[PDB]
């Protein structure tokens, strides 16, 4: 349901 | 938040979203109290009855947000956690007594029009403002009703309730580390926090110095916005000696 | 130090739409 966040934070 | 309204832009710039890395989902609200410290409810991180026990690497905080689900490019900032601190006498076994936790960020967050810390109350501000009938403000991205989810941050203003009314509304044992808020059935107006609003702030605007202070943390309730029930909030000032000890030592 | 003063409200002397409700309760 959430827009994917930038991979750099994961 | 039940029976609230859409927040204005920048209305609650201390609002923090606690976000699970995998699966990517909202876990809780929280608040910004300096460039490196975030305040939330202990049960957002540790609640063994529900097999909840998060570690730092499980979690992110998202600061500066308005939209619940959008990635708000150039506005929100996402921070990793250095360390979690839960109150040592947090009572998850019984009644969520001392439902408070601090999260230290790995790096300081840059303040902006959308990102700014709330004040924590001194004894005098707490004594003056934590009075039955006085209203505070609760914000969050949690459920809009007990039994969907909002597009943007929700806000509701609620009056503090007399402690005997709080006690008489529930079978749960209340403590001096809690207060409750909400309208009475006769008052007409409605509103409450709900699941997903956990850990977010109950704030009051001091009429003495026109600053916003965080008096409470969304802690617990039996349902959401039920007649004759009230939301319960961690009494931040009562626990401020623990807050200061953590920040001063870490 | 700067805590509790919002860039888009107190810092610009703008009020949000419901903060008056809080003030009116502080009797
Ligand atoms: N329904 C229980 C009642 C209870 C059980 C055990 C000890 C104390 C209270 C409850 O609130 N919780 C269970 C643990 C977490 C907490 C919660 O869901 N918090 C969030 C909110 C729900 C409604 C409002 Br308003 S805030
Ligand atoms: C929570 O998890 C940590 C690390 O996994 C562990 O050390 C701690 O004992 C756990 N606490 C509870 C109450 O289960
Ligand atoms: Na009771
Ligand atoms: Na109610």
**Structure token pair of residue B106:** 């790995």
**Distance between CA atoms of residues B10 and C14, nearest Å:** 11
Which CATH number is associated with domain B15-117+240-249?
A: 2.40.10.10
Residue B184 to residue C3: CA distance in whole angstroms: 33
What is d(CA B52, CA B198) in angstroms, rounded to the nearest whole number? 14
Q: For residue A8, give every residue at least 6 positions away whose Cβ sits within 8 Å of its Cβ, in sequence order, or none.
A: none
The verdict on whether B112 is a catalytic residue reads no
Ligand 2 cavity residues, CB under 6 Å: B 46, 48, 53, 55
- Bond before B157 cis per omega within 30 degrees: no
- DSSP state, residue B39: E
Q: Which fold has domain C1-27?
A: Epsilon-Thrombin; Chain L (4.10.140)
Cα–Cα nearest to B205, from A10, C16, A3:
C16
Edge to edge, the sheet with strand B212-220 lists B5-6, B154-159, B135-140, B201-205, B212-220, B231-235, B178-181
Which residues on chain A are in Cβ contact (under 8 Å) with B25?
Answer: 1-2
Report the candidate in B206, B219, B139 with the shortest Cα–Cα distance to residue B172.
Answer: B219
DSSP code of B93?
T
Which residue has tokens 């709330």? B118
Q: Which residues of B are less than 8 Å from C17 in CB distance? A: 8
Inter-chain residue contact B69 with A5, CB threshold 8 Å: no
Provide the H-helix boundaries in chain B: 123-129, 163-168, 240-249
A 10 A CB-CB count for B67 gives 16
**Which chains form contacts with chain C, at 3 or more CB pairs under 8 Å?**
B
- Is the distance from CB of B235 to CB of B175 less than 8 angstroms? no
Distance CA B134, CA B120 (A): 18
Which stretch of DSSP H or E encloses residue B26? strand B25-32
Bridge partners, residue B81, by sequence: B105
Residue A8 main-chain phi, psi, to 5 deg: -60, -25
**Cα separation, B115 vs B94, whole angstroms:** 35
- Whose structure tokens read 């402690």? B163
Question: What backbone phi and psi angles, to 5 degrees, belong to B19?
Answer: -130, 130
Among residues B12, B31, B43, B192, which one is catalytic? Answer: B43
Do B4 and B51 contact (CB within 8 A), yes or no? no
Instruction: Note whether A3 contacts B71, CB cutoff 8 Å.
Output: yes
Alpha-carbon dihedral angle through residues B30, B151, B211, B82, given to the nearest 10 degrees: 30
**CA B93 to chain centroid:** 20
Q: Where are the domains of chain C?
A: 1-27
> B96, B123, B88: which is closest to B217 by C-alpha?
B96
| E strand or H helix at B113 | none
Report d(CA B189, CA C24) in Å as an integer. 16
3-state secondary structure of A7: helix
For B150, the token pair is 């909002």
Q: Is B198 a catalytic residue?
A: yes
Q: What distance in Å separates the CA atoms of residue B223 and residue B225, rounded to the nearest whole number?
A: 7
C-alpha–C-alpha distance, residues B144 and B167, integer Å? 25
């Amino acid at each position: 349901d959430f827009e994917e966040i930038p991979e750099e934070y994961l | 938040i039940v029976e609230g309204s859409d927040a204005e832009i920048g209305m609650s710039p201390w609002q923090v979203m606690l976000f699970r890395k995998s699966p990517q989902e909202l876990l809780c609200g929280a608040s910004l109290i300096s460039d490196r410290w975030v305040l939330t409810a202990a049960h957002c991180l540790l609640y063994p009855p529900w097999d909840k026990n998060f570690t730092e690497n499980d979690l992110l905080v998202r600061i500066g947000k308005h939209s619940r689900t959008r990635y708000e490019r150039n506005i929100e900032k996402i921070s990793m956690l250095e360390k979690i601190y839960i109150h040592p006498r947090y009572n998850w076994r019984e009644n969520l007594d001392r439902d408070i936790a601090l999260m230290k960020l790995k790096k300081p967050v840059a303040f902006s029009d959308y990102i700014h810390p709330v004040c924590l109350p001194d004894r005098e501000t707490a004594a003056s403002l934590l009075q039955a009938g006085y209203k505070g403000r609760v914000t969050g991205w949690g459920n809009l009703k007990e039994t969907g989810q909002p597009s943007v941050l929700q806000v509701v203003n609620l009056p503090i309730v007399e402690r005997p009314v709080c006690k008489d509304s529930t079978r749960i044992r209340i403590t001096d580390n809690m207060f409750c808020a909400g309208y009475k059935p006769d008052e007409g107006k409605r509103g409450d926090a709900c699941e997903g609003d956990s850990g977010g702030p109950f704030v009051m605007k001091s009429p003495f110095n026109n600053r916003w202070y965080q008096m409470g943390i969304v802690s617990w309730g039996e349902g959401c916005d039920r007649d004759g029930k009230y939301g319960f909030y961690t009494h931040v000032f009562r626990l401020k000696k623990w807050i200061q000890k953590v920040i001063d030592q870490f | 130090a700067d805590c509790g003063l919002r860039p888009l409200f107190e810092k610009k002397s703008l009020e949000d739409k419901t903060e008056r409700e809080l003030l009116e309760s502080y009797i």
